[PDB]
Amino acid sequence: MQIFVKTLTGKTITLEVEPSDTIENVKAKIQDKEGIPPDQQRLIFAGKQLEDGRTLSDYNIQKESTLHLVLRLRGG
Template sequence: MRIRVQIDDARKTIHLDVESTDTIHIVKAKIQAEEDIPTGQQFLFLPHKRLHDSFTLAGYYIQNESTVYLAHW
């Protein structure tokens, strides 16, 4: 499936090919590979919910074409 990652308040959006069984940590690794943002500096969110590394996309009910939000420092 494919998800959108909106980076830093919509300044940039990327698309990632992922599996529903991927953990948030795996998604962060894919973002690092594409955007060169270290995984330890990434915070992924849904509206009003921070996503934790050990949970899967399916665990957060993230589906094809869903949008997640990335803040980083």
């Protein structure tokens, strides 16, 4: 199933995944397409941040599901 991931710049990405894929695996897919590190990515859906150990089914996600990816930074 291809899911859509929208960022904070009016941009959306489609990734062919499955309901048994881990969030860390999804962040890695976006890292290969956009070229951004997974550690600097935050997947949020239905007003809930997804864990890297949990999968897409743990948060009730289906095909063509939209997600909110964010970019985290550091200071020190």
